[PDB]
Design a protein around this nucleic acid. Structure first.
Ligand SMILES: Nc1ccn([C@H]2C[C@H](O)[C@@H](COP(=O)(O)NP(=O)(O)OP(=O)(O)O)O2)c(=O)n1
Ligand SMILES: [Mg+2]
Ligand SMILES: [Mg+2]
Length: 424
DNA sequence: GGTCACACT
DNA sequence: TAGTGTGAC
């Protein structure tokens, strides 16, 4: 196939944590902004950045003190601290607002706290049926961009260029054909406009979206015209788009695999992948990766949009870097208890909200000087939503790790995760 | 820094 | 694992 079977959208909130704080605090609005956690060290780590702030070069993971140097006026919203650790409840709850709205339109997959994939194939056919032999107006796509267009003097302005590109696309469109993938993408884009308007109107949160035939392309497209804009990436636009597209850009090619792909094949762009036979790619990167790469560089992916509105696992973690590493048994127990308590609060709310219970508890830790995020992973049955029992059980699981009332080596990280959810 | 999902074997 | 490592937000 040409992988034009489905219409898929990825909707991603623009600087989400910042928006949540901005909505709550009007003074932050339309200003260089960032969300930080753990203010005491280096002003705290920046985890979210407003677009005004990004203009000053402020970036995520940048110490607030350093960010201040770039942007003296930068406004900061602090992640809530509960029980001595960052609490992300406000953002999770804000995420639910967005997810619930999106769920109304189509079957959604929660890719992250601030984004979800949508399969609009069914919705599109019905809408196509609803409007018959009906030409699609540009007004229905006020925030839509057509990648690769315009092509072949208002062009000086970005909005003018967007209008020209959109017009070229629409004039080209043949609406008398229901089957056409481009038409389907276009109608899908119309719905996404409606979906995004509903999100903004109902939550006050602005978002961006990518409309394409698969998840990878939808995701890539979404990023192209952020913020507060949606981009339609057609099948035909892929060759030109991928021709200069760094391999790392494609989802899942951001890490080692992307590097090896680049390193082994001596190429920099997605498009260059077309040269190679499927076997060739399979030989270097194996059976699953090779097939995925071969199809993907051709704008073809089959990964389905999973029907998962609600997350699979609920986890609590904290880090005790460097000196702060826990070197006493009582210390480990107290922190396990703090994690367990928050987990219990989240688990209990989850059970009431989602009608399910977690049957398995996962405990993960890191010892100092270990190069691995997890020094050890251990699991024990989770039979009660009791923080004291859970923390007590977790200690039992990891206690042996200690080497000779004091803990050695000191623990750099503690992780608690509830998993294996069951209906209740 | 804190949470995720998932492909391994 | 069951338990580890990858890639993501
Ligand atoms: N390393 C990261 C990346 C994201 N996040 C959190 C904070 C973000 O606001 C939120 C959403 O991630 P994101 O979509 O990658 N970025 P954000 O929404 O902030 O800005 P956009 O670029 O998407 O407009 O998750 C995080 O906590 N740690
Ligand atoms: Mg976002
Ligand atoms: Mg995101």
């Amino acid at each position: 196939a040409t992988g034009q079977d489905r219409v898929v959208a990825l909707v991603d909130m623009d600087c989400f944590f910042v928006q949540v704080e901005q909505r709550q605090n009007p003074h932050l609005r339309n200003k260089p902004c960032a969300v930080v956690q753990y203010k005491s060290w280096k002003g705290g780590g920046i985890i979210a950045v407003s677009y005004e702030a990004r203009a000053f070069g402020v970036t995520r993971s940048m110490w607030a003190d350093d960010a201040k140097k770039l942007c003296p006026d930068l406004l900061l919203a602090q992640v809530r601290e509960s029980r001595g650790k960052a609490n992300l409840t406000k953002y999770r709850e804000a995420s639910v607002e967005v997810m619930e709205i999106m769920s109304r339109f189509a079957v959604i997959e929660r890719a992250s706290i601030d984004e979800a994939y949508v399969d609009l194939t069914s919705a599109v056919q019905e809408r196509l049926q609803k409007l018959q032999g009906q030409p699609i107006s540009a007004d229905l796509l006020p925030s839509t961009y057509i990648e690769g267009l315009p092509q072949g003097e208002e062009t000086v302005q970005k909005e003018g260029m967007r209008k020209q590109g959109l017009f070229q696309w629409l004039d080209s469109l043949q609406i008398d054909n229901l089957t056409s993938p481009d038409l389907q993408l276009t109608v899908g884009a119309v719905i996404v406009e409606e979906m995004r308007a509903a999100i903004e109107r109902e939550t006050g949160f602005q978002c961006s979206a990518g409309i394409s035939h698969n998840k990878v392309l939808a995701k890539l497209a979404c990023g192209l015209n952020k913020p507060n804009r949606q981009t339609l990436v057609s099948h035909g636009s892929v060759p030109q788009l991928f021709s200069q597209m760094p391999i790392r850009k494609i989802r899942s090619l951001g890490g080692k695999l992307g590097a090896s792909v680049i390193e082994i094949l001596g190429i920099e762009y997605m498009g260059e992948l077309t040269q190679f036979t499927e076997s060739q790619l399979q030989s270097h990167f194996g059976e699953k990766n090779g097939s995925w790469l071969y199809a993907m560089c051709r704008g073809i992916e089959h990964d389905p949009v999973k029907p998962r509105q609600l997350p699979k696992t609920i986890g609590c973690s904290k880090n005790f870097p460097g000196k702060t590493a826990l070197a006493t048994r009582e210390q480990v127990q107290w922190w396990l208890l703090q994690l367990a308590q928050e987990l219990e609060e989240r688990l209990t709310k989850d059970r009431n909200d989602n009608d399910r219970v977690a049957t398995q508890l996962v405990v993960s830790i890191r010892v100092q000087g270990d190069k691995r995020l997890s020094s050890l992973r251990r699991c024990c049955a989770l039979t009660r939503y009791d923080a004291h029992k859970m923390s007590h059980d977790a200690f039992t699981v990891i206690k042996n790790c200690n080497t000779s009332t004091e803990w050695s080596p000191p623990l750099t990280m503690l992780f608690l995760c509830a998993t294996k959810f069951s209906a209740s």
